[PDB]
Amino acid sequence: SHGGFLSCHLIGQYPETYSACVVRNPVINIASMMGSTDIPDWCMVEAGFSYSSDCLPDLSVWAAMLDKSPIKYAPQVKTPLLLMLGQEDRRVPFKQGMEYYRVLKARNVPVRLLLYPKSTHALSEVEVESDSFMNAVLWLCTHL
Amino acid sequence: PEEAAALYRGLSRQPALSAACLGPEVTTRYRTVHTEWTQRDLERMENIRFCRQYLVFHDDSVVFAGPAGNSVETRGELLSRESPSGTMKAVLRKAEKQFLEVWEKNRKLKSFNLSALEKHGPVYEDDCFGCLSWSHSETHLLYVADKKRPKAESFFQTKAAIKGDQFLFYEDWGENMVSKSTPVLCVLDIESGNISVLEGVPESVSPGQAFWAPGDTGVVFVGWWHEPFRLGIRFCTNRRSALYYVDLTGGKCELLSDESVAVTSPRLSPDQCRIVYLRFPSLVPHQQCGQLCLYDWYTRVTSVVVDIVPRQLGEDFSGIYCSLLPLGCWSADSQRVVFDSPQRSRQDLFAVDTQMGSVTSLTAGGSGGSWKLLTIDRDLMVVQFSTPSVPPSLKVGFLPPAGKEQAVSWVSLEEAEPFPDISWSIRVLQPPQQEHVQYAGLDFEAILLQPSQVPMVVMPHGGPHSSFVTAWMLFPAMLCKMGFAVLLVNYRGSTGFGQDSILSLPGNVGHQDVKDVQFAVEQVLQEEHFDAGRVALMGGSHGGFLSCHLIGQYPETYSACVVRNPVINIASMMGSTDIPDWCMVEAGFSYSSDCLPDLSVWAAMLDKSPIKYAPQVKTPLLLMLGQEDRRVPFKQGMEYYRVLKARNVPVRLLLYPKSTHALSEVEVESDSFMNAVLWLCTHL
Amino acid sequence: PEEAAALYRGLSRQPALSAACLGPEVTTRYRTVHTEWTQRDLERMENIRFCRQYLVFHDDSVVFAGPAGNSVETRGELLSRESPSGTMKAVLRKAEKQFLEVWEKNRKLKSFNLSALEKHGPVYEDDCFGCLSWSHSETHLLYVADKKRPKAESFFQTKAAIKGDQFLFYEDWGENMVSKSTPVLCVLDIESGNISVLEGVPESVSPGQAFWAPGDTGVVFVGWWHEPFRLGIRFCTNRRSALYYVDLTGGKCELLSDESVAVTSPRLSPDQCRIVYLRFPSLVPHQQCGQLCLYDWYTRVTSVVVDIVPRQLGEDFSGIYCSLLPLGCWSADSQRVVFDSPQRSRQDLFAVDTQMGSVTSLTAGGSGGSWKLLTIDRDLMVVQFSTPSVPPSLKVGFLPPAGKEQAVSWVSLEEAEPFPDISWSIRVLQPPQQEHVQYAGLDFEAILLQPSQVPMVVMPHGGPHSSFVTAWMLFPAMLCKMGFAVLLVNYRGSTGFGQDSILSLPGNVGHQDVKDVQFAVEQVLQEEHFDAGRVALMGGSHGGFLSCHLIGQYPETYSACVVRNPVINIASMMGSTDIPDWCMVEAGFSYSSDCLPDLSVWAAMLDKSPIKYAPQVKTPLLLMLGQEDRRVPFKQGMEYYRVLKARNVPVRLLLYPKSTHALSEVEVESDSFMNAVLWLCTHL
Amino acid sequence: DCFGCLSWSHSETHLLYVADKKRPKAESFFQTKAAIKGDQFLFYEDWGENMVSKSTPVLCVLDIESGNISVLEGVPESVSPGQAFWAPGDTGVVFVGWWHEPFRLGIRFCTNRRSALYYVDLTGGKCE
Ligand SMILES: CC(=O)N[C@@H](C)[C@H](C)O
Ligand SMILES: CC(=O)N[C@@H](C)[C@H](C)O
Ligand SMILES: CC(=O)N[C@@H](C)[C@H](C)O
C-alpha cells in the first residue's frame, strides 16, 4: 500500500541502491486516484489542501498531485519489480498498478504481475496470502 | 404506466433479420433461400432466434417467389456454414461444452467433442476473429480458438505442472472480449478426426479472419499487432494489422500488404485469382473512410480500385464506411463487387468494377430508406429494406449486366405492415464564425420525426465518428407514438460526409459539435414552430458528453435530460480505459505508447471536460450506468452525480450490476427505456 | 471390443421418423410436407430431434417431389399443432417452466406463462392423455393438465392453507406416469388471455383425448374410471372407459357409448357429421382385437363398421390391433378410413368403408415389409416403409377412388441405403398332443435372419399379447452383422393371428408357449442345418420368463442366456405390481378388486413360476435389472440370481439405478446391448 | 466491529442489536401476475471499503418473553447509529451517530468522520 508508494519513490529516485522490489496494491498516481476511491479527502489532505465537499480542484492542485506522484520518476527505474493486485480493491483501485506496469513494460524492464480476481485491499484470504507470500519469498531468493 | 407498457410490447413484436444464404439450384429452375431472424421475448426476457425457408423460381428473372414452411426456433447454435457445394453443413453447438457437428441430408454424420480432445481453449464466436471456412476439397475445416495455457498448481497441494503460476495475468482485447488473450488457427480433418494447430504465425501477432488459399495449399489471414499493449478493438478500425499467408506444412510465412496501416475484410473471387480488402490510411480517428484495394494472386501486384473521397465524388458517392464486407460480395463474372455504405443521412448499395474503377449506386434516387445486403450468389442478391415508418422487409433481386446496373427490379419475399402515424424528413443545415479555416463550406444534416404545442426530444449520436441513418429505430418510433417530436442530429464529424468532415472534428471536441447541435435545435424550433417551453435532451455515451455540455453551457433552454454511460472527465478517464489513444486524439495530441503526459495536456483535457460547467446546471437529470462497463468506467457518472447532489439538484440514478457499455440485455434495455419514457413524460 | 463399438456406432447413425404433417396448397399447384426425425447421439449421449421440409408438386398425380432445405435441430418442444387453416401454429415449450406460444408467419404473436397464472399443474406430454386441439373458430385452444392441490404447511412454521396435510398420498397411473393423479381439461382464449377449467367432468372419471365438438359448442372426450383403484394404463387396453360430451357453459354432461367396455381413439370426419372409435369387447387380456364403431352426430345412432375376426377374414385381414388411430385418418369424401394394422408376421395398411363395411388392403402382396401411416390430408398419404435389411424410408401417395384402392403408386421422398448382407425369411410352424380341444388348427410363425457352423440366437417377444413384425430392428441386425443367425418367434397368443390365438393363451402360460418355442427351435435346427452345439437365448419381461423356463425345463440345449427385467414368481409379483390383474388372468383366475387370493390361487401361480426349475439351471446367465421398474419389481430377478449363485451357477448382474421396464435411456441402452453381445460371443 | 453490537438489558429480559433497514419491494414493468414498479435497479450507497451492501443501519430490540421485534423511532434521518448500549435503568438507548450527508465517506481505517453521542428513549422517540 502506502509502503508500496514509498518503495516506488525509492527505486525511482535512487536507482543504483537496490536489487529487487515487491509491492502489493501500491499508489502510483494521486490525481487519477482521487476520482475513483471512497476517500477523496485523503488525497487532498496528503497533497496539502483542505478538503471541501462542494468544491472542484483547479489546475494547481492537479499539478501538485502530479509532482508528488512516483510515476514522474518512472523512466529511471532499473530494478526488477513484482506486483500483486486485487481486482476487487476499492480503497486503492487496481488500475494504479497497471499503469505503472505498462510504463515499465514499454521500456523493457523485467516485471512480473499477479492479479487476484476476488481479493481486496488486505489480501487476507488464506490461499491468497499463502500464494503471495510464497511468490515474494521465491522472487527475493532468486534475484538476491 | 399501462399504456406505455402496451405500446412497448406492441412495438417490440416486429422481428429483425440476422443472416441469409442461398441453396443449390434444382432443375424441375428454382432455389431455396434460408433466412434467420431474431426477436425479443418479454415473457421469458430473452432474445429468440429462429429460421425460415423461402422458394424462388427463376427462368435472369424472378418468375415466382413464396414461403416454403413455418418458423422453427433453434437454441445453442453459435457458428454455421453451408458447404461450398451445398451437400453438407458444419455447425458449432454449445450443448457447458462445445461440439462441432457435420450434418448431411437428414442425418448427423459425425460430431466432435472439442473440449475433451484437450488441444486448445474455447472457440471464438465473435465477428472480429470468428471464422469457419470449408476446404476447397471439402475434406477439412478451419476455425480460430484460444491458446492452451499450461496447467498450474498451488504450493500446498495434497497429491496421492508449474507451481505458483496459478494467478498469473493474461491481457484481453478490451471491451466485450473478456478472457480472450491470444487466438490460434486450428484445422480439423473430418475423415481421421485429428486437430492440428498451425505453426507459422508470428509470435507478436494475433491471427483472424482466415480462409483457405486457392488450391488448398495454405491459409490466408489478417494479423493484428499486440506489442507492447493490447488496445481495445471493438468499434475501432485503426489498429495496426497486415495480411499474411502461411503454408500448412513447414511453417513458411509470407507478407502480402503494407505493415504500417490497418487492413481488413479480405475476400476471394469465385475464379480464385484475386483478393479484395479494405485499407485505412490514418490511425488517429477510430472510424474513417477506407480504400478498396485489390491483389492479384498470380501476377503478385496490388492496386487501388477505390480511393478516399475528400468531400463527394458525384451526387451519389461519399466513401466507403463499412467495417466488414459481406461474406459473399463478388459476382459470377468475378469482376464486380457489391457492398453497402452510408451516404449523407441514408444507406445505399453500390457496385464497383475492379478494372475500370467506377462505382454505381443501385438504390440511387427516391425519398430515402436504408438498404442492407445479406448475400449474393450467382448474381442473385438478398436485401433487407427498412425505413423509420416501417419495420424491415426482405427482398430478392437479380444483378443486371455491366452498364445497366441502375435498372434493377425487386421482388418482395416478406413485407411488414407500416405505421402511417409517423412522418420523417431530412433537414440540411449550414453553419454561420463557427467555420474553421482549413475546412470551410461543410454542412451537416438532421432527421426530424413528427406526428402525421408539440414537445421535442433531441438525440445526438455517439462515436463521435458514427452517424444516424433512416432505418427502423425502436425508441424514436415509440417516442413519436407517445407524442414527442424527435430530432436526430448528425453534427460535423459524422460518417457518410467525406474524409474532411471526419478530420475536422479531432482537436475541437467540446466547442464545435455543441454549437452545431444548438444551432440545429434553434433553427428547427424557429422554422417548424414547436413548443419552445418543453424541449428535452437524451444522449448516450459521447452524446451524453454533448448533452452534459449543452445543459451546462445553456441552462435555460432545456427542461430534462437522460444520459446513459456519459463521459465526464477526460483526464480521469485516460488512466482507466482500454483506449487511452481516444482521449489523446480527441484532445488534439498524438498518442505515443512510450510517453507520459505533461501538465499542458492535463490542462487541455480539464478545459474540454463538461465537469467544468457543473456548478451552473439547473435541469433535472437521470443517469443510467453499467457497473461492469470497461470502455467508459462507471465512476465518471458518479462524480457528476456527486457534484450535482452537493448543490441540491434533483438527480435520479440507476446502476445495473452486470450491464455493459451497450446495455443490450433485454431486461436492462426494457427497464431503462421505460424509466426514460416515464421521466420525460412526467417532467415535460 | 473395438469392432463391436464401431459396428454399433455405424448402425445407430440411421434416423427414424416421428411425425408428419401437410401444409396449405399454393397455386403457382404444390404442397409442403413437414417431417420430424429422431436420432441417437453417442458423443452427447442423448436423443436428438430435428425437422425437415419437402415440396411435392401435384397436378391427382405426383408430378414432382424433392427436398426444400436442410435439417434444423429443435430443443425444448413438447407438443405442437398446426392451425386447421394452416395460418398459425401453437407450441408448448419447456424453457423449468412451461410456455404456450402462438407463432404466425415469421413472428411470435404471443406467449403465455402457464405456471405463473397459478390455475393448474404441469401439462400432459404423454400420448394416452396428452392433446392439443385448435377451435373450429380458430380463437380458442384446449389441452389437459394436472389438477391443483391445495397448499399445505407444517405445524411449526415461522410466520411474519391446510396444516398437517403436507405428506398426503396421491395415487398415480402406474408405470411411467409418476405424479399424474387426476387430469383436467383447460381452455385458453387467445384474445383475452384467460384460462378456464371445464366444470362438467364426473368426479370418478379422468378425462383425456379431447377434441372440439362440431360448432364449437362443447368438448367430446374419453373418460377412464379410477374407482376404487388406479390400475396401470401403459401397454394395457382393457381399462373401463366411455365417451362423454360436456358443454362449455352449464356443466351439462352426456354419454355417447356403452359404459361397460373400453372405448378409445375417437376421430371426427371433415364433414363434421360422424365419429369413429375403437371398442374392446373383453377385459381379461391386456391386448386383444377390437372393433371399429361409428356414431352419427345428427341421427344419434351407433353401428359396427368392422367386427372381431375369429381366425381370418380372407387372405389379407386378421383384425384391428392398433391402440391409437392416426391423428388424420378420414378421407376427403368423409366415407373411408385408412389405418395400419399387423397381419401375420408383417404390418399393412387398410382402407375401410363406413357404409358398405368392406376392408381393402392397399399394401397386399409382395415379399414383406412394414408400413406405417403418418397422416392423410386431402387424399394425400404420407407413409414410412421399413424392412429388416433397410432403414426406414419416406413415401408419398395418392388415394385412388373407391373400388380401385389396390392400384396405388408411391413416390420416394427419402430413401436410405440398404444392407445387402442380411437375408430374412418367414417360417410357418404347425404344433403336433400339444393342441388344445377348444382351439385346434392354429399355427404360428418365426422370422429367421441369416448371413447372405453358424450359431443361433433365439428371441421370444414380451407381452405376451404382442408380436414381432418385419421392420428395422437394430439389435437383430447388428447380431446378424456380427455373424449370429437370429430367430424371432411369434408363439401362440401373439397379435395379428385372430382373436382365438389371443384367447387360447390365458390359463396355460408356462406349459404351452415354452413348448412352442422349443418346437420352433428344434424344427429350424433340423431343417436349416445350423450348429446345434452353440445356441443362445435372449428375452425381456414375458420373454425373460419364457427363457428361464426353457433353460430349466431343457437343461442341455443352450450355451448362454441374457435376460432383462424378467418375471420369476407370479405369486410374489401380485402385491408389488401396478397391474395385479395380469397375474390372475394369466394364471387362469378372474381378477376382482374386492378379493383376497386363496391357497389354490397361490399354488397355481407358484407351479407356473420358473423358479420351481431353478435347481436344474446350468447355463451361464447375464441379468440386467432396472432399480425403478414398477411393472416387474426388480426383486424378481434378484431371487433367481440368489438361488443360482448359492448353487454356484455363473451369473453376472448389472443393476441400472434409474432405468425402468424399457431401459430406453441412451446411456443404459448402449451399455446393455454392448455387454450382451460380448457375453454371447465369449460363451458361444 | 464499527457498528456491530449486542447488549443484554439490565433487567435481563431484552436484547438489542443493529441491522440493515428494510427496502420496499420492487417489481418489473412486465411481470406475469396470477410494490413499486420500475425501482428495481435503484442505487443504494454503501460505506466504502469492506462494507459492501451496508447503507443505513437501524437499532432493533427483541423481547425474549413475547418474541416481538421493534425498531426504535427516534434516530435522526441524516445519521447512522451504532455502538449502542442500554442506559442506566433500562429507560433508553445511548449510541454513537455518524453523519452521512451528503456523501458516505469511507470508514475503515479512518477515525476522522463527523460523529456525535445520542440518547433515545424507548417510547416517544425523544432524542437528546
Ligand atoms: C488509507 C489508505 O488509503 N491506505 C492505502 C493507501 C494502504 C492499504 O495503505
Ligand atoms: C469509443 C468510445 O469510447 N465510445 C463511448 C464514449 C460511447 C459508447 O460512445
Ligand atoms: C403388460 C406388461 O407390461 N407385462 C410385463 C410382465 C412385461 C414388461 O411384459
Author numbering:
A (entry chain D): 587 to 730
B (entry chain C), C (entry chain A): 10 to 37, 42 to 72, 74 to 109, 117 to 181, 200 to 471, 473 to 492, 499 to 730
D (entry chain D): 148 to 181, 200 to 293
Study text:
Acylpeptide hydrolase (APEH) or acylaminoacyl‐peptidase (AAP) is a serine hydrolase that regulates protein metabolism. It can also bind to and process unusual substrates, acting as a detoxifier. The most prominent physiological function of APEH is the removal of N‐acetylated amino acids from the N‐terminus of oligopeptides and proteins (Perrier et al., 2005) thereby exerting crucial control over the proteasomal degradation of damaged and misfolded proteins (Adibekian et al., 2011; Hoernstein et al., 2023; Hwang et al., 2010; Palmieri et al., 2011; Sandomenico et al., 2021; Shimizu et al., 2003; Shimizu et al., 2004; Tangri et al., 2021). The S9 serine protease subfamily, the so‐called oligopeptidases, employs a further, size‐based selection process (Kobayashi & Smith, 1987). Their active site is sequestered in an inner pocket that is formed between the catalytic hydrolase domain and a propeller domain that caps it.
Here we determined the tetrameric structure of pAPEH in complex with acetyl‐alanyl‐chloromethyl ketone (AcACMK), a covalent inhibitor using cryo‐EM with a maximum resolution of 3.19 Å. The AcACMK inhibitor hydrolyzed into acetyl‐alanyl‐methyl‐hemiketal (AcAMHK) and bound covalently to the active Ser587 and His707 of each monomer of the tetrameric pAPEH structure. The oxygen of the tetrahedral center (most likely an OH group in the stable form of the complex) is oriented by the oxyanion site—the backbone amides of Gly509 and His588—similarly to what is expected during catalysis, however, neither distance (3.9 and 3.6 Å, respectively) is close enough for the formation of a proper H‐bond. The amide NH moiety of AcAMHK points toward carbonyl oxygen of Gly509, which is—again—similar to those seen in substrate complexes of serine protease enzymes, but here it not quite close enough (3.8 Å) for a strong interaction. The acetyl group of AcAMHK is coordinated by the Nε‐atom of Arg677, which flips to fulfill this interaction (as compared to its position in the ligand‐free form of the enzyme). The small Ala sidechain of the inhibitor sits in the shallow, rather hydrophobic S1 binding pocket. Furthermore, the loop holding the catalytic His707 also shifts closer to the inhibitor by 0.5 Å, as measured at His707(Cα). Since in this case a covalent bond is established both toward the catalytic Ser and the catalytic His, both the His‐loop and the oxyanion‐loop move closer to the inhibitor (and each other), tightening all three dimensions of the active site. It seems as if the too spacious active site of the ligand‐free form would attempt to move closer to activate the enzyme sufficiently for binding the inhibitor, but the resultant active site pocket still seems quite a bit looser than in the case of the canonical binding mode.
